[PDB]
Design an enzyme around this catalytic site. Sequence first.
Site, PDB file in Angstrom:
ATOM      1  N   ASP A   1      15.947   4.162   1.910  1.00 29.08           N
ATOM      2  CA  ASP A   1      16.638   5.467   1.912  1.00 29.08           C
ATOM      3  C   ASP A   1      17.113   5.814   0.490  1.00 29.08           C
ATOM      4  O   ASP A   1      17.385   4.907  -0.307  1.00 29.08           O
ATOM      5  CB  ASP A   1      17.836   5.431   2.902  1.00 29.08           C
ATOM      6  N   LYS A   2      17.141   7.127   0.179  1.00 31.01           N
ATOM      7  CA  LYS A   2      17.631   7.687  -1.106  1.00 31.01           C
ATOM      8  C   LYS A   2      16.580   7.546  -2.247  1.00 31.01           C
ATOM      9  O   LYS A   2      16.736   8.153  -3.310  1.00 31.01           O
ATOM     10  CB  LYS A   2      19.025   7.076  -1.482  1.00 31.01           C
TER      11      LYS A   2
ATOM     12  N   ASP B   1       3.943  -8.425   5.055  1.00 33.16           N
ATOM     13  CA  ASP B   1       3.282  -8.211   3.740  1.00 33.16           C
ATOM     14  C   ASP B   1       4.211  -7.437   2.760  1.00 33.16           C
ATOM     15  O   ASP B   1       4.883  -8.063   1.925  1.00 33.16           O
ATOM     16  CB  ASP B   1       1.915  -7.480   3.961  1.00 33.16           C
TER      17      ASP B   1
ATOM     18  N   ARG C   1       0.467   4.207  -3.857  1.00 31.28           N
ATOM     19  CA  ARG C   1       0.561   4.726  -5.242  1.00 31.28           C
ATOM     20  C   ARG C   1       1.686   4.007  -6.020  1.00 31.28           C
ATOM     21  O   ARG C   1       2.798   3.849  -5.521  1.00 31.28           O
ATOM     22  CB  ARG C   1       0.746   6.274  -5.355  1.00 31.28           C
TER      23      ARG C   1
ATOM     24  N   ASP D   1      -1.323 -24.064   5.212  1.00 30.17           N
ATOM     25  CA  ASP D   1      -0.203 -24.393   4.304  1.00 30.17           C
ATOM     26  C   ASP D   1      -0.343 -23.551   3.030  1.00 30.17           C
ATOM     27  O   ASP D   1      -1.441 -23.485   2.454  1.00 30.17           O
ATOM     28  CB  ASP D   1      -0.221 -25.902   3.933  1.00 30.17           C
TER      29      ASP D   1
ATOM     30  N   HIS E   1     -28.746   3.678  18.548  1.00 35.27           N
ATOM     31  CA  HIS E   1     -28.600   2.920  17.283  1.00 35.27           C
ATOM     32  C   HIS E   1     -29.959   2.306  16.858  1.00 35.27           C
ATOM     33  O   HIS E   1     -30.018   1.138  16.449  1.00 35.27           O
ATOM     34  CB  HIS E   1     -27.519   1.807  17.467  1.00 35.27           C
TER      35      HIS E   1
ATOM     36  N   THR F   1       3.985  -5.808   0.091  1.00 32.23           N
ATOM     37  CA  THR F   1       3.814  -6.174  -1.338  1.00 32.23           C
ATOM     38  C   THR F   1       4.081  -5.003  -2.346  1.00 32.23           C
ATOM     39  O   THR F   1       4.561  -5.281  -3.450  1.00 32.23           O
ATOM     40  CB  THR F   1       2.412  -6.839  -1.607  1.00 32.23           C
TER      41      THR F   1
ATOM     42  N   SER G   1      -6.380 -30.534  10.895  1.00 28.54           N
ATOM     43  CA  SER G   1      -7.305 -29.415  11.097  1.00 28.54           C
ATOM     44  C   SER G   1      -7.256 -29.007  12.573  1.00 28.54           C
ATOM     45  O   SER G   1      -6.983 -29.845  13.444  1.00 28.54           O
ATOM     46  CB  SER G   1      -8.742 -29.830  10.702  1.00 28.54           C
TER      47      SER G   1
ATOM     48  N   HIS H   1      13.618  11.970  -2.971  1.00 25.35           N
ATOM     49  CA  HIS H   1      14.492  13.122  -2.692  1.00 25.35           C
ATOM     50  C   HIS H   1      13.661  14.337  -2.239  1.00 25.35           C
ATOM     51  O   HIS H   1      14.217  15.419  -2.017  1.00 25.35           O
ATOM     52  CB  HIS H   1      15.322  13.434  -3.962  1.00 25.35           C
TER      53      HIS H   1
ATOM     54  N   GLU I   1      10.186  -1.349  10.400  1.00 23.74           N
ATOM     55  CA  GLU I   1      10.977  -0.869   9.256  1.00 23.74           C
ATOM     56  C   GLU I   1      11.371   0.603   9.480  1.00 23.74           C
ATOM     57  O   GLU I   1      10.589   1.378  10.055  1.00 23.74           O
ATOM     58  CB  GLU I   1      10.181  -1.012   7.917  1.00 23.74           C
TER      59      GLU I   1
ATOM     60  N   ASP J   1      14.793   3.974  -6.480  1.00 26.29           N
ATOM     61  CA  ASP J   1      16.184   4.240  -6.104  1.00 26.29           C
ATOM     62  C   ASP J   1      16.452   3.546  -4.760  1.00 26.29           C
ATOM     63  O   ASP J   1      15.912   3.938  -3.727  1.00 26.29           O
ATOM     64  CB  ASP J   1      16.417   5.778  -6.035  1.00 26.29           C
ATOM     65  N   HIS J   2      17.266   2.490  -4.806  1.00 30.24           N
ATOM     66  CA  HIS J   2      17.485   1.594  -3.659  1.00 30.24           C
ATOM     67  C   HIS J   2      18.517   2.148  -2.657  1.00 30.24           C
ATOM     68  O   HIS J   2      19.356   2.991  -2.997  1.00 30.24           O
ATOM     69  CB  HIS J   2      17.880   0.172  -4.145  1.00 30.24           C
TER      70      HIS J   2
END
Lengths: 471, 155, 155, 155, 155
Positions: free
Chosen positions: A349-350, A175, A188, A73, A434, A177, A124, A353, A344, A391-392
């Site tokens: 877009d846009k 996500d 970045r 939750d 190993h 974010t 649980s 450039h 996605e 720029d959306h």
Amino acid sequence: MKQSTIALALLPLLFTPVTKARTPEMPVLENRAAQGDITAPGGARRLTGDQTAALRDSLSDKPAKNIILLIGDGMGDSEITAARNYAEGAGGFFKGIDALPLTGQYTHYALNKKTGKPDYVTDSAASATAWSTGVKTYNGALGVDIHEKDHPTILEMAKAAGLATGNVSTAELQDATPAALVAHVTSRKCYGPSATSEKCPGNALEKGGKGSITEQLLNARADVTLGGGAKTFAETATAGEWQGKTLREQAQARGYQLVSDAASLNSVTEANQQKPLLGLFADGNMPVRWLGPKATYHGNIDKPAVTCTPNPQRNDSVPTLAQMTDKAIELLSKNEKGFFLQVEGASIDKQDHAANPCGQIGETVDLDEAVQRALEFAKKEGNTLVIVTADHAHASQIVAPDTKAPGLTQALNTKDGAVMVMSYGNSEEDSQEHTGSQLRIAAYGPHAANVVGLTDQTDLFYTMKAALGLK
Amino acid sequence: MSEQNNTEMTFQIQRIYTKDISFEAPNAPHVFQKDWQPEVKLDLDTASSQLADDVYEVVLRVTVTASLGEETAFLCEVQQGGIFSIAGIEGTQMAHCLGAYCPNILFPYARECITSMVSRGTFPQLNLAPVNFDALFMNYLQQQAGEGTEEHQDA
Amino acid sequence: MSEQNNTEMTFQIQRIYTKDISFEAPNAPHVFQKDWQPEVKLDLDTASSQLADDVYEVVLRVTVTASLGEETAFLCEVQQGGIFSIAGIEGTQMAHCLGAYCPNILFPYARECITSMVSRGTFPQLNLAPVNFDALFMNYLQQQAGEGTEEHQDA
Amino acid sequence: MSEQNNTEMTFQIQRIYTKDISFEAPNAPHVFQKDWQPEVKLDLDTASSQLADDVYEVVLRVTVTASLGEETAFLCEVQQGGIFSIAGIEGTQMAHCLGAYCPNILFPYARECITSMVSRGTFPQLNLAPVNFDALFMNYLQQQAGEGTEEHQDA
Amino acid sequence: MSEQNNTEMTFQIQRIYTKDISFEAPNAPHVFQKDWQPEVKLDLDTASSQLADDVYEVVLRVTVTASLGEETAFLCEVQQGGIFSIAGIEGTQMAHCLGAYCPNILFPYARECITSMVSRGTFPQLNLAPVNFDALFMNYLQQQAGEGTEEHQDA
């Protein structure tokens, strides 16, 4: 060696039995494909090659993460915190908000509303098993009886480990974010200081072995590489939750705790009911105390500088690439493959450039550009002076492509439409490489005795009998 | 791993445990004269084993070498293994699952098991920080795969 | 670091540790006749005080009230405390960073602490499922109108 | 504190710890599919060393193993080293006091370590029986006792 | 010689475990700016109760304190329990098993929990000094030796 003692780096390679964890290429590193391994010499090995073009940055910069279980939750907080870390300090403590008063520093309103009623969470979902191995025999052998497995009950439920069952993990909210302006396209900026990453965390390129003083290697210069929620974390996003409690829990959420449960008959068969005789520990003439000198706060205490140092090179960079092998795997068969459920359509877009990279008309490039590119890093220190604004687009990410890509014709030689399983790959073969099985080290050797000699091939004079701890 | 009842991925955590431990303290008694946080050398390894269809048991080997000055203090190593059903997954969410979701729950156990062998050897408290595996491997498989137009011929 | 800062929130985890721990098995040798995963209530409370300049300690009480059948199995609780540095944030959201995000950091390691004590009591391995107490305490912040103006001399 | 027992001449433990630990479980996820018929091997090893002025060591290397042919279930080997401040006494007294009695007293602590590290592999517990070399030591020495200043309460 | 049955005092270990565990550290961050000299106070509490037919429980609580007056550093408390199948009416013989042997068997398991809990509070490790529980009953004398009844008093 390896900057910051408290590290972990990463891992040599991802899990091979799952599938091949790398996309195929055709123009290695260069999309223009200049292609010139001198002539008779090839130059430097540069086996990594395409790896320098593989995203670049995004070490501390998180574009995504997740961690839930069968219940969870939750609701993302409105703060939108950019976290980071910097433990120890070893100078000035901290600066900013001198007074830090909570609304309730001590829980007078209480976070828990008293366990006697459903607070918010109750249910649980997990599964596990206990153990025994009941030893026996005292004289001669201190454990020789094959006793553990009593006749198994119907307890083995199978469905005790339910197969996830999320559903929410696709067509609600992923996500995403850093969904804003990015001076790279993916990672970045957006929010926080990003993967600032003070230079490539090489320590001493690869290992180093032994360097002059600890001034270079961690103990002096311990400005941590962000770490501890480096980008954002706890940004306004729903985890999907799904398995919500509500008041509907009442069947279990009545109260099988605090009052024991509904079977609370006031001392059932646990308190005094089990004991007939026995009356020891009435008194003991053996005290404890410290029989010799002690010092708890002698030492063995220090401030561990906690960092997230990935290091671009761990021990040796192996050829981390798996293309096709079979080749005709691209041609595939009846499978379709083109429908990748939901994805996605790149960034919005846009937005970009392609002004920040742009490029140059290097049809025939000479060694001038190849050598000066080593010197041009000084120019790159200045960053993209032109700040790419958010720029959306008219179409929101997933709905940015109008038509879907039909498979077969889109060969797509790295999808579900694959053959030959994994083309051998690698099993538990190199497990021996190993440091396995070989006598690599055994401290150094016997330091020998002093007060005694103790040099006898028979350790004690008791060939003690085993059968005291089974699987 | 086929198509039937797959949809997208097959994930479940079945069991958490340790497969292998090592701890060699050559200067175990010699620590008494040296009181500080020792030099630490981190090495990792990728070990796995197939148990069933889609059921793979994946292991995070964490090697820690500790040294007080230019002398070895102790040696420690854990293999945090776990039984999982993990197959079918593809694309971006692959590295996001086995590089973020799976390591973050197994890390406190490998860490504590190391710290336990150290604390059983009765050395200075040594515990490792939660690193983000997700993006590190996610970057390595990024090469123009966002636009899968392919364009070979037809079939 | 510390100096050369800019106009943006700064946050530093200084120390993660247990200020208090508990594991209490009253019906312990009686309830070992029961071999299955204990029915667990996930129960969370907090407590804290300022004992630091521009830094505040928040303690997460991760509580596990477990029962096997018609009796209590065990009662486990860990006050996992942490010294968290915060600055460059104001209002209610200011202190809610340590009143939500900071003990949410502590929770994976609170799970680990409990799990080990469950197995020390020879009970079946208990891995706590992650939950956001964030939502609950968020409500408790806006559900307080005490307001001492200053006070805070004690804690 | 200020009531250092020291019966003129005394054997006094100042530290007990695991110098070396080793766990190998190749068939850790195979333990379930394999037969419940392991051959449990035990091995005894004892060595001693000087550390400092009147500061001495004895190590008990207990080696527990379970195997089914070539496929090993688990390995549990613990060099339970102990710092013993042994002085004032000499001859066959100290020879068997550190050579036989000290590793026997380390056996509860080695039992403990082995029990914990095998349970970290989520394998079953093994609580080995006790044996009384304290009685054996006093018995072989003279039985009647005296001369050698035994650690003795009012009784 | 014909054993046949002869239940001449039953000795078998069921299991060992932590019944109760605790750690407290109010001045856990406050420690850094105090005098590093705590008065380490030791305590041992004793409990015992029969559970089932020939199955008895022995509990030894260990409680360690560290406080330099009112200025308290920390606290740790572990009620270590051990289940041993013992019977036959052993008298002075069982007075060894539960009142001497078992305190020494449970001693390392209680001690590891304390040494872990201080390391969990991220404090300098502290190992408890050994107590000669059986040596007391060993040097002394049982008047009838033990006498385990014997049903027939003949054969």
